[PDB]
RNA sequence: CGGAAGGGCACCACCAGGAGUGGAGCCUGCGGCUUAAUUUGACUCAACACGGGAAACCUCACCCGGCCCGGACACGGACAGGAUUGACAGAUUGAUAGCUCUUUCUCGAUUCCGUGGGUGGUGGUGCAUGGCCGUUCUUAGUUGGUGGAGCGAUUUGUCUGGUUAAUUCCGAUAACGAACGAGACUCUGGCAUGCUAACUAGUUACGCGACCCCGGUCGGCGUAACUUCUUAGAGGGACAAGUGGCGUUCAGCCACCCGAGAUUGAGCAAUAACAGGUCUGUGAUGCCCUUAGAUGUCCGGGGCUGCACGCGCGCUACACUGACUGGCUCAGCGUGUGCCUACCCUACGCCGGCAGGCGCGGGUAACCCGUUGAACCCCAUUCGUGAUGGGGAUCGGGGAUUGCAAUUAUUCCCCAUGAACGAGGAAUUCCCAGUAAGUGCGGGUCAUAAGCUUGCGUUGAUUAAGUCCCUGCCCUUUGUACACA
């Protein structure tokens, strides 16, 4: 039965197991505390979150 | 879409008693986490809210993984009624 | 793409009239009965019936199953 | 009867103006205060690659964020000195206070 | 633009040198071959340990099979005398996918059938684009307004000279007043025995304890001062300020005193651009393609690791300035118990050669790991110029951990095997003071996890204070039949 196999598979971990939370994308993630943000959103909204470049 | 009508009057019976409705963007997540009440995953639904939006009963805004729904004049109207509720029966939107 | 065969065929309701006629005691003297086995669900207690083959019995709403 | 705050925040200069309006307050609320104790900076670092592909110089920002945070310690009874935990708050700071 | 001239500049240039690389083994990326697939983007600088790209599954886009609709909504149909959900056997399947087949049950308007339309896409198009990045371009360059010269394109301002890292200033002046860039700016490094303060940092005293012979040691225990060490705030500090030359006695340059510093390192970075890269970061996105026998999505297996060759980034080395084995003795950045979310860092007791395991504890952290007993280095053994005890590739057997699963060996161990390699051709990269180079430790990646990258320390130089020879850059003049130059 699909409706007890369609989601019986173990991501349990891997990359697999983690996205972007902005984009829901696989690649290029930080998990460095906890930001769980791929590197280009993390990019994007770095100055929002309160990641200064001053150095 | 396929789901007893019992899980979709806790849909609409949440979207009553707040009359709005957030859903993350998941259709594998085993249960909604309001709505642990009833065995209603997300997969369970998002899309028929969809069906409301695209009928116009609510109109939908998508932040960063998170449906967000809104109810409208139209919706109401039409949601107390295939709820059989009267109009004694209203929302928070309705109610000071 | 390409393909093998032709397509597996979906499995067809086989449209039966009146798919209660199998089941209750119909005469003139004022009984009533049942054909089929009652299921011992407990969930459903004494509303609808098994799947009574040559075989083994099968309820549906709880997917019981008795054989010989 | 001795309590501790903990200030935390990002930005130095709207805590210290907090961490020093408060200590003003309490040696004119007649205490015995020890002023302010500055824990060592937490500076959170992250280096990324500046291009969304693969392309071009292999530059990299380096991101930092810079948390500071001080323990102001107070010998004074629990409502002498509930005053300034709730007042002289500004939207960077967040309190964490202890008694035992 | 010049294999034209003048004036300057840069270790992505050169000199003087240092370490190398190119030679070998292996890692890893790229091409090529092979294949069911060996997914793909990028090809001088500005592709090639890059896409944070260390892929067992997932990732995954590739291939071979099998499910699902997760096709909104509208219209017309059938439809409670049933539109349609779901299923135990048994075949069938790879499979306990009712996926189907035979048999019947169940469920109840949620559906399904068609018709329009919509949704999704790591499909295509970066030669339609946005955003971001890189590059031209780390050099000093760029532009208005008003006025002047030209019919005009344009030019002047934006400059003869001196000077500067600088279009930086003095000065000159058909220009005057301005704007950006540069500089200033923020962080970082160095300095304060002056301030603020410290039971989550200590120092010094004093009391007690332990050991030795009144004193010495103690990160053994504890409390009266203090903030030197530590932390991190407020200030101070350095300005070519002082002296002596050089200088239109200007702008400024050289040397020296006094002193922590007489040039710490980065970040930001103009106008104009480039068919540079990215549609595979995105629910940023136009168009096109596809949409139920799917390019959606899921599951199982495989590939991305395939191997005659070529290249690039790297690691280990070729030993005695070393190797092995004992002993001794010193860091600085960090990170650490997770919304989903399972996965943290570990002190210490015991079993085990070892990876490991079995128990109790601390730590959401200047509190516990931790005084981070790091490596190199230092002292003592054994070796002895031998492809040797250099080197550790390849390969065989066994033992643990993570994982649902390790075979094409995930990783780690143990024993054994003991290859090339004797300092690398033409060529060629990076760099000048805490620099190169050696050396380890963090972070990212991470269930298992560094030959990569980003940081941190530790030890610490040779040579250079110059030039335009080479490769390029800037300005002026000049020539041009070039102008996608
Ligand atoms: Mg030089
Ligand atoms: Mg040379
Ligand atoms: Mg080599
Ligand atoms: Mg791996
Ligand atoms: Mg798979
Ligand atoms: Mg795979
Ligand atoms: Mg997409
Ligand atoms: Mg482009
Ligand atoms: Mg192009
Ligand atoms: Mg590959
Ligand atoms: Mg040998
Ligand atoms: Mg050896
Ligand atoms: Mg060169
Ligand atoms: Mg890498
Ligand atoms: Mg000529
Ligand atoms: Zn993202």
Same mark, same amino acid.
């Given at each position: 039965?699909?409706?007890?196999? %369609? ?9 697999? &197991?983690? *996205? ?9 993630? @930080? ?13 994007? %909204? ?10 | ?10 849909? %609409? ?12 963007? $998941? ?9 642990? $009440? ?12 969809? &069906? ?10 998508? =932040? ?6 809104? +109810? ?19 929302? =928070?939107?309705?109610?000071? | 793409? &390409? ?19 199998? %089941? ?8 009533? *009965? ?35 | ?42 500076? +959170?670092? @992250? ?25 102001? $310690? ?27």
């Amino acid at each position: 039965g699909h409706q007890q196999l %369609y989601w019986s598979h173990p991501r349990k971990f891997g990359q697999g &197991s983690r *996205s972007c939370r902005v984009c829901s994308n696989r690649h290029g993630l @930080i998990r460095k505390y906890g930001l769980n943000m791929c590197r280009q959103c993390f990019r994007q %909204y770095a100055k929002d979150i309160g990641f200064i470049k001053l150095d | 879409m396929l789901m007893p009508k019992k899980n979709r009057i806790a849909i %609409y019976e949440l979207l009553f008693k707040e009359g709005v409705m957030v859903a993350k963007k $998941d259709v594998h997540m085993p249960k909604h986490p309001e709505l642990a $009440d009833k065995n209603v995953p997300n997969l369970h639904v998002m899309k028929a809210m969809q &069906s409301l939006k695209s009928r116009g009963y609510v109109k939908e805004q998508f =932040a960063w993984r998170h449906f967000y729904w809104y +109810l409208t004049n139209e919706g109401i109207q039409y949601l107390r009624d295939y709820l059989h509720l009267p109009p004694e029966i209203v929302p =928070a939107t309705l109610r000071r | 793409k &390409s393909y093998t065969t032709p397509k597996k065929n979906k499995h067809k309701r086989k449209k039966v009239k009146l798919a209660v006629l199998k %089941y209750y005691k119909v005469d003139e003297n004022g009984k009533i *009965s049942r054909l089929r086995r009652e299921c011992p669900s407990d969930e459903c207690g004494a509303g609808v019936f098994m799947a009574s083959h040559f075989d083994r019995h099968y309820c549906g709403k709880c997917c019981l199953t008795y054989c010989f | 009867h001795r309590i501790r705050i903990t200030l935390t925040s990002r930005n130095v200069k709207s805590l210290e103006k907090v961490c020093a309006d408060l200590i003003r307050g309490a040696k004119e609320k007649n205490l015995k205060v020890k002023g302010p104790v500055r824990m060592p900076t937490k500076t +959170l670092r @992250i280096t990324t690659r500046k291009t969304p592909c693969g392309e071009g110089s292999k530059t990299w920002d380096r991101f930092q964020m810079r948390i500071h945070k001080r323990l102001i $310690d107070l010998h004074s009874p629990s409502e002498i000195v509930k005053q300034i935990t709730s007042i002289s708050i500004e939207p960077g700071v967040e309190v964490e206070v202890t008694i035992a």
